Write a protein that binds this ligand. Structure first.
Ligand SMILES: CC(=O)O[C@H]1C[C@@]2(C)[C@@H](C[C@@H](O)[C@H]3[C@@]4(C)CC[C@@H](O)[C@@H](C)[C@@H]4CC[C@@]32C)/C1=C(\CCC=C(C)C)C(=O)O
Ligand SMILES: CC(=O)O[C@H]1C[C@@]2(C)[C@@H](C[C@@H](O)[C@H]3[C@@]4(C)CC[C@@H](O)[C@@H](C)[C@@H]4CC[C@@]32C)/C1=C(\CCC=C(C)C)C(=O)O
Lengths: 305, 305
């Protein structure tokens, strides 16, 4: 028992992290097979970042301008290309530590693990969610760009995020591994505000199921509700609307606990309308929304990799 | 910016996890050099667990009764011995993935990362603290025994915890890597209640410094206090008493932020007396106490490994 914000074991990704230096800029890259992926803004100076023309800046760069270092050993760069907002550096050596992997573009509300890195060296690992406004609430300092987010299905690493920027509000923006930003953000130091950070309703419900499984039940009540009735409440509290797809995804937690999804919605409704009255749920004094239904089943069952 | 409950990268420990089977019991072991460490209750049947005589039970076991499997390959056991509550299984092969390591016995209030494992396979990583009552609030299912807790200082893994048991209240008990339990617990299925789970005052103060560094400042007030005055408040709220040693350890966060330690104590005092009035600090609606002063400096600076 016990329920924790749990990251995937990071070893398979640690073996892929390298340092990329272009001119005087250094950040992290991801070495898979014979390609190193990194943010294209590695080619920018401090000056360039206000409105860079990446295609023009890249004309001035050759393979030998990209210094790639894997631990203590230098990699030989034999080609380079820009794909959307990432650079792909072809090296002459396949990473012998390459895990089975895929590139995935996740949906808002999905969770993943981040391996924060500096100078190609891993610093820590933590769990995040793609927020509905397509930011993530990470922990990133200068030098952390190129750190990646990922999920692991047994032996396969699904890479879903590469870190590019911190917005003025302290939240984080980045791309998938094809270099397309999540949300409307651009790799330019300009005014870009984040939209409404709505709460991921299906995740809160999953976490309430986790609470019940782990002994925290005081929030269970005598009520039920309907999808439409619940969603009038969700709207008022800036919660995502709940759909039948969400209900279906919660089925297995319903089955394990014997608590119908709409009954649990009625408990969440009461929690939204009345607050938690100084009580806690799984060690938290607010409603946690960065556990997916899959996350709860995985942690409460013990799937390994 | 941003502040997250962050675990150490787990790769160095993943390479040490093995499966140990004695008879029909299977749990996890830690393979360092040519020794495998695991909980001695691997030799117990379900029956034996009420009051086992481990020395008598071990008489019936030989080297070949301990099946040790590292991934897909079997290890040859060439000796075995009991040290306190752990077994040490000597194998004929040194683990080629052994990191530089030490064994450390941590103090209550210190934090560490746990690599939850099942059948020798890592499942996830998360950050915990040794509570003042010498339990930890983990996430452990049946089969997770032998999973370990650790810190990493650059290249050196300091192992501090091996998981042995879940208490009836859902919290967790275990040993250092010399096999001595933290707290008064025993590897016996009997009545053992946990003591008062007091809050780790110096950690809360560190986390408040982290909040200030990361933009959350609404809890700063116009007041100061004294150690003795603050501790009258700490006592009332089941907080650990604050000592000058604690004050000294917070010096660097004081210096970075320009907020004197006793001023921050006065802010915490007001938070304890008045609550947070529906506000949040670093994404939390309660006062977090599982970040040490060192944890805050590390995350807010970017130390790597
Ligand atoms: C190594 C390092 O510290 O670089 C950091 C620090 C960085 C050079 C930043 C890019 C850009 O803001 C930079 C300028 C010159 C932008 C213009 C002004 O505002 C300056 C006051 C500011 C100082 C440095 C800073 C803040 C970096 C980034 C790039 C982030 C990506 C984008 C698209 C902004 C990085 O993390 O690589
Ligand atoms: C693989 C597995 O499921 O074993 C788990 C499950 C386990 C065999 C447990 C040890 C002990 O409680 C067991 C008994 C027989 C204890 C006596 C009764 O209460 C039973 C209702 C109970 C059922 C199984 C259980 C709960 C295990 C432990 C050992 C934990 C260590 C101690 C000292 C208790 C383990 O995790 O290895």
């Amino acid at each position: 028992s016990g329920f924790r914000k749990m990251a995937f074991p990071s070893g398979k990704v640690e073996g892929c992290m390298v340092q990329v230096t272009c001119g005087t800029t250094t950040l992290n890259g991801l070495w898979l097979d014979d390609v190193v992926y990194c943010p294209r803004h590695v080619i920018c100076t401090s000056e360039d970042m206000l409105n860079p023309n990446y295609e023009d800046l890249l004309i001035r760069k050759s393979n030998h301008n990209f210094l790639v270092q894997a631990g203590n050993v230098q990699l030989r760069v034999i080609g380079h290309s820009m794909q959307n907002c990432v650079l792909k550096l072809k090296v002459d050596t396949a990473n012998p530590k390459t895990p089975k992997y895929k590139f995935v573009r996740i949906q808002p509300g999905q969770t993943f693990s981040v391996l924060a890195c500096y100078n190609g060296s891993p610093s820590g690992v933590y769990q995040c969610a793609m927020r509905p406004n397509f930011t993530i609430k990470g922990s990133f300092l200068n030098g952390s760009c190129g750190s990646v987010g990922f999920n692991i299905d047994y032996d396969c690493v699904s890479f879903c995020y590469m870190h590019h920027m911190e917005l003025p509000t302290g939240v984080h923006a980045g791309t998938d591994l094809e270099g397309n930003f999540y949300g409307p953000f651009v790799d330019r130091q300009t005014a870009q505000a984040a939209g409404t950070d709505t709460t991921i309703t299906v995740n809160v419900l999953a976490w309430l199921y986790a609470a019940v499984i782990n002994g925290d039940r005081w929030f269970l009540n005598r009520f039920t509700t309907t999808l439409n009735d619940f969603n009038l409440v969700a709207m008022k509290y800036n919660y995502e609307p709940l759909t039948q797809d969400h209900v279906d995804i919660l089925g297995p937690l319903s089955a394990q606990t014997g608590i119908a999804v709409l009954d649990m919605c009625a408990s969440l409704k009461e929690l939204l309308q009345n607050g938690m009255n100084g009580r806690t749920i799984l060690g938290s004094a607010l409603l946690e929304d960065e556990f997916t239904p899959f996350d709860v089943v995985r942690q409460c069952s013990g799937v390994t990799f």
